[PDB]
Design a protein around this motif. Structure first.
Motif, PDB file in Angstrom:
ATOM      1  N   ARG A 146       0.852  -1.203   0.000  1.00 39.71           N
ATOM      2  CA  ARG A 146       0.000   0.000   0.000  1.00 39.71           C
ATOM      3  C   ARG A 146       0.882   1.245   0.000  1.00 39.71           C
ATOM      4  NH1 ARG A 146      -5.097  -0.662   4.146  1.00 39.71           N
ATOM      5  NH2 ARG A 146      -5.763  -2.749   3.501  1.00 39.71           N
ATOM      6  N   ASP A 147       1.177   1.772  -1.182  1.00 37.14           N
ATOM      7  CA  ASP A 147       1.841   3.068  -1.284  1.00 37.14           C
ATOM      8  C   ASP A 147       0.792   4.163  -1.106  1.00 37.14           C
ATOM      9  OD1 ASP A 147       3.244   5.372  -1.879  1.00 37.14           O
ATOM     10  OD2 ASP A 147       4.003   4.663  -3.806  1.00 37.14           O
ATOM     11  N   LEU A 148       0.880   4.909  -0.006  1.00 40.32           N
ATOM     12  CA  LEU A 148      -0.071   5.980   0.264  1.00 40.32           C
ATOM     13  C   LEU A 148       0.336   7.311  -0.352  1.00 40.32           C
ATOM     14  CD1 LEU A 148      -0.688   5.219   4.049  1.00 40.32           C
ATOM     15  CD2 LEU A 148      -1.731   4.162   2.063  1.00 40.32           C
ATOM     16  N   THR A 149       1.597   7.464  -0.748  1.00 38.41           N
ATOM     17  CA  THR A 149       2.029   8.682  -1.425  1.00 38.41           C
ATOM     18  C   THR A 149       1.702   8.644  -2.911  1.00 38.41           C
ATOM     19  OG1 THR A 149       3.810   9.039   0.170  1.00 38.41           O
ATOM     20  CG2 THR A 149       4.003  10.126  -1.958  1.00 38.41           C
ATOM     21  N   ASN A 150       1.753   7.459  -3.516  1.00 39.13           N
ATOM     22  CA  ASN A 150       1.527   7.272  -4.948  1.00 39.13           C
ATOM     23  C   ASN A 150       2.541   8.043  -5.786  1.00 39.13           C
ATOM     24  OD1 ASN A 150      -1.289   5.868  -4.559  1.00 39.13           O
ATOM     25  ND2 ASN A 150      -1.373   7.800  -3.423  1.00 39.13           N
ATOM     26  N   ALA A 151       3.784   8.082  -5.302  1.00 34.85           N
ATOM     27  CA  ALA A 151       4.836   8.817  -5.992  1.00 34.85           C
ATOM     28  C   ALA A 151       5.055   8.268  -7.396  1.00 34.85           C
ATOM     29  CB  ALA A 151       6.131   8.765  -5.185  1.00 34.85           C
ATOM     30  N   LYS A 152       4.937   6.947  -7.555  1.00 36.37           N
ATOM     31  CA  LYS A 152       5.096   6.311  -8.860  1.00 36.37           C
ATOM     32  C   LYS A 152       4.079   6.805  -9.878  1.00 36.37           C
ATOM     33  CE  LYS A 152       4.608   1.810  -9.180  1.00 36.37           C
ATOM     34  NZ  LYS A 152       5.051   0.425  -8.858  1.00 36.37           N
ATOM     35  N   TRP A 153       2.867   7.137  -9.440  1.00 35.16           N
ATOM     36  CA  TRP A 153       1.863   7.650 -10.365  1.00 35.16           C
ATOM     37  C   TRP A 153       2.243   9.017 -10.909  1.00 35.16           C
ATOM     38  CZ3 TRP A 153      -1.230  11.851 -10.952  1.00 35.16           C
ATOM     39  CH2 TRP A 153      -2.269  11.744 -11.880  1.00 35.16           C
ATOM     40  N   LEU A 154       2.652   9.933 -10.035  1.00 38.29           N
ATOM     41  CA  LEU A 154       2.979  11.279 -10.486  1.00 38.29           C
ATOM     42  C   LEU A 154       4.237  11.310 -11.347  1.00 38.29           C
ATOM     43  CD1 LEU A 154       2.461  14.257 -10.508  1.00 38.29           C
ATOM     44  CD2 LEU A 154       3.691  14.448  -8.358  1.00 38.29           C
ATOM     45  N   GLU A 155       5.282  10.580 -10.956  1.00 32.94           N
ATOM     46  CA  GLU A 155       6.478  10.525 -11.792  1.00 32.94           C
ATOM     47  C   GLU A 155       6.226   9.829 -13.126  1.00 32.94           C
ATOM     48  OE1 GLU A 155       8.876   8.278  -9.045  1.00 32.94           O
ATOM     49  OE2 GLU A 155       9.105   6.652 -10.507  1.00 32.94           O
ATOM     50  N   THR A 156       5.342   8.831 -13.158  1.00 26.40           N
ATOM     51  CA  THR A 156       4.964   8.218 -14.427  1.00 26.40           C
ATOM     52  C   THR A 156       4.177   9.183 -15.301  1.00 26.40           C
ATOM     53  OG1 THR A 156       4.938   6.033 -13.403  1.00 26.40           O
ATOM     54  CG2 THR A 156       3.788   6.284 -15.487  1.00 26.40           C
ATOM     55  N   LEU A 157       3.292   9.973 -14.700  1.00 25.68           N
ATOM     56  CA  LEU A 157       2.566  10.984 -15.455  1.00 25.68           C
ATOM     57  C   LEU A 157       3.516  11.990 -16.098  1.00 25.68           C
ATOM     58  CD1 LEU A 157      -0.081  12.230 -16.342  1.00 25.68           C
ATOM     59  CD2 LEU A 157      -0.122  13.504 -14.201  1.00 25.68           C
ATOM     60  N   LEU A 158       4.489  12.487 -15.337  1.00 24.95           N
ATOM     61  CA  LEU A 158       5.477  13.408 -15.893  1.00 24.95           C
ATOM     62  C   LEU A 158       6.320  12.749 -16.978  1.00 24.95           C
ATOM     63  CD1 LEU A 158       6.493  15.002 -12.518  1.00 24.95           C
ATOM     64  CD2 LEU A 158       5.317  16.187 -14.364  1.00 24.95           C
ATOM     65  N   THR A 159       6.649  11.473 -16.805  1.00 23.06           N
ATOM     66  CA  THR A 159       7.409  10.741 -17.812  1.00 23.06           C
ATOM     67  C   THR A 159       6.608  10.569 -19.096  1.00 23.06           C
ATOM     68  OG1 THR A 159       8.608   9.579 -16.070  1.00 23.06           O
ATOM     69  CG2 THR A 159       8.642   8.619 -18.267  1.00 23.06           C
ATOM     70  N   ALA A 160       5.401  10.012 -18.987  1.00 17.15           N
ATOM     71  CA  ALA A 160       4.588   9.706 -20.157  1.00 17.15           C
ATOM     72  C   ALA A 160       4.198  10.952 -20.943  1.00 17.15           C
ATOM     73  CB  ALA A 160       3.335   8.946 -19.731  1.00 17.15           C
ATOM     74  N   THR A 161       4.105  12.105 -20.289  1.00 13.55           N
ATOM     75  CA  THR A 161       3.731  13.331 -20.980  1.00 13.55           C
ATOM     76  C   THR A 161       4.892  14.052 -21.653  1.00 13.55           C
ATOM     77  OG1 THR A 161       3.854  14.522 -18.874  1.00 13.55           O
ATOM     78  CG2 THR A 161       1.690  13.710 -19.580  1.00 13.55           C
ATOM     79  N   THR A 162       6.132  13.818 -21.228  1.00 13.14           N
ATOM     80  CA  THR A 162       7.267  14.552 -21.767  1.00 13.14           C
ATOM     81  C   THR A 162       8.277  13.680 -22.500  1.00 13.14           C
ATOM     82  OG1 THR A 162       8.505  14.402 -19.687  1.00 13.14           O
ATOM     83  CG2 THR A 162       7.038  16.293 -19.975  1.00 13.14           C
ATOM     84  N   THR A 163       8.100  12.365 -22.510  1.00 10.01           N
ATOM     85  CA  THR A 163       9.069  11.443 -23.083  1.00 10.01           C
ATOM     86  C   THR A 163       8.418  10.640 -24.198  1.00 10.01           C
ATOM     87  OG1 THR A 163       9.905  11.225 -20.823  1.00 10.01           O
ATOM     88  CG2 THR A 163      10.902   9.850 -22.514  1.00 10.01           C
ATOM     89  N   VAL A 164       9.175  10.410 -25.270  1.00 11.36           N
ATOM     90  CA  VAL A 164       8.775   9.438 -26.275  1.00 11.36           C
ATOM     91  C   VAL A 164       8.881   8.043 -25.683  1.00 11.36           C
ATOM     92  CG1 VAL A 164       9.228   8.556 -28.574  1.00 11.36           C
ATOM     93  CG2 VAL A 164       9.551  10.973 -28.105  1.00 11.36           C
ATOM     94  N   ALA A 165       7.815   7.262 -25.820  1.00 13.49           N
ATOM     95  CA  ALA A 165       7.882   5.851 -25.476  1.00 13.49           C
ATOM     96  C   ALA A 165       8.775   5.120 -26.465  1.00 13.49           C
ATOM     97  CB  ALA A 165       6.486   5.239 -25.473  1.00 13.49           C
ATOM     98  N   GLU A 166       9.689   4.306 -25.939  1.00 11.97           N
ATOM     99  CA  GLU A 166      10.614   3.587 -26.803  1.00 11.97           C
ATOM    100  C   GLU A 166       9.896   2.569 -27.679  1.00 11.97           C
ATOM    101  OE1 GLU A 166      13.360   1.683 -24.186  1.00 11.97           O
ATOM    102  OE2 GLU A 166      11.734   0.614 -23.158  1.00 11.97           O
TER     103      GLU A 166
END
Length: 602
Positions: free
Chosen positions: A212-232
């Motif tokens: 149980r990740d209560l911060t959900n840090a992985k969600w926000l960093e993934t959002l920033l990644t997926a919006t600014t990075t080309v998927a390989e």
DNA sequence: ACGACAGATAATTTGTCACTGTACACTACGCCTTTTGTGGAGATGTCTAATATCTACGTTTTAACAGTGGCCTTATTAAATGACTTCTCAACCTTCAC
């Protein structure tokens, strides 16, 4: 099944609630997450899956260096202990599941090998059907547990005649049959086993416990990644999507207090029962409970005071309280989480410890178990364990002077059989087994009595609420609801009705069916039929009998069995397991279920 | 002797005329019977075409529905809901704090 939970709201001023929330959310749950991660990477993890057992101490050993890691260091000793218990029970659960599934896969893979048609059995035996029928008649006359005995006989008998005769004998349910094999019903029965093996093989690809990740840090960093990075490639973008759709855990893991005396009870000057927890005595919580449970919370103080007055000459091994869970219940609306969510204590009690007669039952159960332990157990700390066990065994003899209620006495020859079915959730027969006569039937309608209208309500709400969810999903509306609490209510009404009838006829036991896993049977049966009807058309196969498969997945036979077991234990009625016959009406099934359990007593 | 010449003579018929017996007196083809081949109704027997009746011949038409045949894509991951399964449900002792 004499353990039950009672619960109360815990009330306190905001700084106590905030301090507890921050202990739980910022330290204890991150520690649990870290322990789950490390435990799933342990070099013995793959051999724990083979044993199906976790080592008794490996979670405690992993937690020791974490207790002084800056991420986790701020907690009381019992909060580390709680995190250990949470993680240990998770893997004890998960390793037990995987172990049984693996045994099921191995068992059915052997059955698929030894399930041969008579056309195949003729070649593989080299004998005419009458010759293997005679050889099966001999092997049955030796194996006279019969099923297991034939499975034992099969493996090491490499003689293909006897091996085929056992195969023929097992195909028929451990017995001879004269009639010819219908080749399409055999081919279907073979196909069912292949589907079952495949579905077991797929279930064995279960995920490791996620935490149980209560911060959900992985969600926000993934959002920033997926919006600014080309998927390989497409697979990275799919992994990004899978993270972005993952919902956030709101609530920390509860705390677990396996020492009943780590809850210290008191009464404040305003007369309210209060509790504090070992390591957090400065946080006084006030008990807010229904009167229907108040007598338990009053008992917890009386048990505590009794052992203090006797200077600990009583044993907390006979305290009515067994353990506590401390839980945040999700609140509606908005706020800081220690204000929004409602702190709730769940106490396990053993119902036998309420009365003096039931306490004597528990005392003997404790004494026998500890005397066994002390005899078998025979270091300094292991000698200290013996001394604590011997102190318990001495002190359980001191009485708590509890209410006297004579134990239920039921006639051994009177049984209640409970037939369980998809259409009729319960039907009961009271049977006088030495007379071989039914004393009473009751239908589902007679068991529910005035509540019988709830049963049509359930069916109607299950239809309605499913359709309203279907409509709401297309709008992305959060208003998705269901009838689970009504279904639970019905199963508890049935359980009380069944046990009250059992008491009324002085039945010695209630007989319940060994249903097995109805859902995997039905699912593999229907798929084998559908693959014949819609060959090469998967969506046609999945549409076939869709509503029947749904109905079987909603059939709450386990919840009803559990409710009956709890209510019978609280009145001391024995539960027995029997085999429900497939022939006949629900009444006849209930009668023959009852009488077979009587005849199966050996 | 008989009979044989020419002529006598007793018939024979022709012709007169007084007398008388009779019908005219109106008064048979007519009365009556039987057969009989031709003819006029008039009860009765003779025996058909035909315009139906009087069902069936069976023969079309309907619609109901039964059976054949084509189509229908399948996977993963997340979520909600309903369920199932598994695991858990200590307790005495030590130590440091008024």
């Amino acid at each position: 099944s004499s353990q039950i939970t009672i619960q109360a709201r815990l009330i306190s001023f905001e700084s106590n609630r905030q301090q507890l929330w921050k202990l739980m959310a910022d330290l204890n749950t991150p520690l649990i997450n870290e322990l789950l991660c490390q435990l799933g990477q342990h070099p013995d993890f793959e051999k724990w899956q083979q044993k199906g057992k976790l080592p008794s101490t490996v979670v405690s050993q992993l937690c020791q260096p974490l207790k002084t890691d800056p991420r986790f260091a701020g907690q009381p000793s019992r909060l580390y202990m709680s995190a250990i218990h949470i993680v240990d029970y998770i893997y004890k659960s998960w390793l037990a599941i995987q172990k049984r599934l693996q045994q099921q896969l191995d068992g059915k893979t052997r059955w698929l090998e030894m399930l041969n048609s008579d056309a195949e059995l003729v070649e593989l035996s080299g004998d005419t059907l009458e010759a293997i029928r005679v050889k099966a008649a001999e092997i049955l006359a030796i194996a006279m547990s019969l099923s297991k005995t034939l499975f034992d006989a099969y493996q090491e008998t490499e003689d293909i005649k006897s091996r085929s005769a056992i195969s023929y004998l097992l195909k028929n349910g451990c017995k001879l049959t004269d009639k010819e094999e219908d080749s399409e019903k055999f081919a279907k029965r073979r196909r069912q086993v292949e589907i079952q093996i495949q579905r077991l093989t797929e279930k064995l690809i279960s995920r490791m416990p996620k935490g149980r990740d209560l911060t959900n840090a992985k969600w926000l960093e993934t959002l920033l990644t997926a919006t600014t990075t080309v998927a390989e490639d497409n697979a990275q973008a799919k992994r990004w999507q899978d993270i972005l759709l993952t919902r956030s855990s709101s609530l920390p893991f509860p705390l677990v207090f396996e020492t009943n005396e780590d809850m210290v009870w008191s009464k404040n000057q305003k007369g309210r029962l209060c509790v504090h927890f070992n390591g957090l005595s400065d946080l006084i919580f006030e008990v807010y409970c229904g009167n229907r449970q108040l007598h338990w919370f009053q008992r917890f103080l009386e048990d505590q005071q009794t052992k203090r007055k006797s200077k600990n000459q009583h044993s907390s091994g006979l305290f009515t309280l067994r353990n506590g869970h401390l839980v945040w219940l999700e609140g509606e609306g908005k706020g800081e989480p220690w204000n929004l969510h409602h702190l709730t204590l769940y106490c396990c009690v053993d119902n036998r410890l309420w009365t003096e007669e039931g306490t004597e039952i528990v005392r003997q159960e404790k004494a026998d178990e500890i005397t066994k332990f002390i005899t078998n157990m025979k270091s300094d700390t292991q000698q200290a364990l013996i001394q604590r066990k011997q102190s318990t065994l001495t002190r359980i003899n001191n009485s708590f002077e509890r209410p006297s209620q004579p134990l239920y006495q039921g006639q051994s020859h009177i049984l209640v059989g409970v037939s369980l079915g998809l259409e009729k959730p319960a039907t009961v027969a009271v049977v006088d087994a030495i007379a071989n006569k039914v004393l009473a039937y009751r239908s589902i309608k007679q068991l529910l009595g005035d509540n019988y209208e709830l049963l049509n309500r359930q069916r109607r709400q299950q239809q309605y609420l499913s359709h309203e969810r279907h409509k709401a999903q297309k709008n992305f509306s959060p208003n998705q609801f269901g009838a689970s609490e009504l279904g639970q209510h019905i199963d508890r009404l049935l359980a009380k009705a069944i046990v009250a009838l059992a008491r009324t006829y002085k039945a010695g036991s209630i007989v319940l069916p060994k249903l097995g896993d109805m859902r995997e049977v039905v699912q593999s049966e229907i798929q084998a039929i559908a693959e014949q009807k819609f060959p090469g058309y998967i969506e046609g196969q999945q549409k076939y009998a869709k509503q029947y498969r749904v109905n079987v997945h909603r059939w709450s036979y386990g919840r009803l069995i559990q409710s009956i077991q709890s209510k019978a234990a609280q009145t001391g009625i024995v539960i027995e397991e029997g085999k429900q016959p497939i022939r006949g009406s629900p009444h006849d099934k209930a009668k023959e279920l009852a009488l077979s359990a009587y005849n199966l007593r050996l």
